[PDB]
């Protein structure tokens, strides 16, 4: 059961890439600055509702746009953190080309917002199935499918590793255009290093 859902070759007609820039010599350098600016925005995002990235630095228009779901206090009360982001990006290198924001329609479509309401109780080793049976029905009301509760070992609070087969729905992967979210994310809260086999789909 290594169902990884090869989306890499599945996307490319609707789901391109987050970073876009015309390069080949500045590619590695541009990619080096991409992760360099991602080491400060990830600590400022505080696990925000970010679906994709709008880093379109092609045609001399470099801008590290961050979705961050709905504009809350992340940008500051009236863009008060946008002026403080200048030095933030100025401390890294010398970019700071006015990063923009994007209003994400249907915020509960990624596997981050669904893991912040049904997988947020797993941090205190609590409900990991009762609350994991929910949200998929809410995702069905939105128009999509949702996530599928799954595990390979350490089932909730137990010293004995146990698997599962609670797949509420299937996942289409026989097509070469199928669009799948597949937003993987784990947290090490004094539990140990382990991998899960959770399956998601648009």
């Amino acid at each position: 059961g290594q169902k990884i859902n090869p989306i890499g070759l599945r996307v490319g007609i609707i789901r391109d890439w987050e970073a876009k820039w015309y390069a080949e010599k500045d590619f590695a350098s541009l990619l080096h600055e991409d992760l360099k600016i991602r080491k400060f925005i990830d600590n400022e995002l505080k696990e925000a509702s970010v679906s994709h990235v709008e880093i379109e630095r092609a045609a001399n228009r470099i801008n590290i746009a961050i979705h961050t779901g709905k504009p809350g206090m992340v940008i500051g009360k009236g863009g008060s953190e946008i002026e403080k982001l200048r030095n933030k990006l100025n401390a890294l290198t010398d970019k700071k080309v006015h990063i923009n924001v994007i209003e994400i329609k249907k915020v509960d479509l990624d596997a981050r917002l669904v893991a912040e309401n049904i997988a947020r109780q797993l941090e205190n080793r609590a409900s990991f199935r009762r609350v994991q049976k929910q949200a998929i029905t809410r995702a069905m009301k939105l128009g999509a499918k949702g996530i599928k509760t799954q595990v390979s070992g350490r089932l909730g609070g137990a010293d004995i590793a146990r698997a599962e087969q609670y797949s509420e729905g299937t996942v289409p992967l026989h097509t070469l255009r199928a669009d799948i979210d597949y937003a993987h994310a784990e947290a090490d809260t004094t539990y140990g290093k382990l991998g899960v086999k959770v399956w998601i789909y648009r």
């Binding site: 059961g1 698997a163 599962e164 087969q165 609670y166």
Partner: protein, 156 residues
Amino acid sequence: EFEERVVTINRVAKVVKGGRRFRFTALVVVGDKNGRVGFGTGKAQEVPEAIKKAVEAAKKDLVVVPRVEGTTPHTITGRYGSGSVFMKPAAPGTGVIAGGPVRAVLELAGITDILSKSLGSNTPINMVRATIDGLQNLKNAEDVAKLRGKTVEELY
């Protein structure tokens, strides 16, 4: 409208090719909220769709249980399988308690004057089959009067 008693949902740890198939056999009493017993077992992945599955496929296994004047017409038994039962009469204006076997047999017969009896074992698959064996073997007032074929007040 219908007193459906869903006792439990027996699960099974299938050890077939698949990692661990989950088959919930939702158990629910198919009572008509009057005096019939009713018993049906499902085998669907959805308990709600499985509980009604046995209620729409097994709803003719009930038996009409009449009442004299608020007391069991006859103290019947139950010799079907291991688990057995017994019909104990009580006053019309009384009640029931907890501690023993199944509770969805005399509770369906809204009379509050019958004591549900079933020793046998804990297995709830051969203990409810003996309850319908005695319910169908119950002796009524006229039912026994026809057996002799004389008068109702000539066989007591």
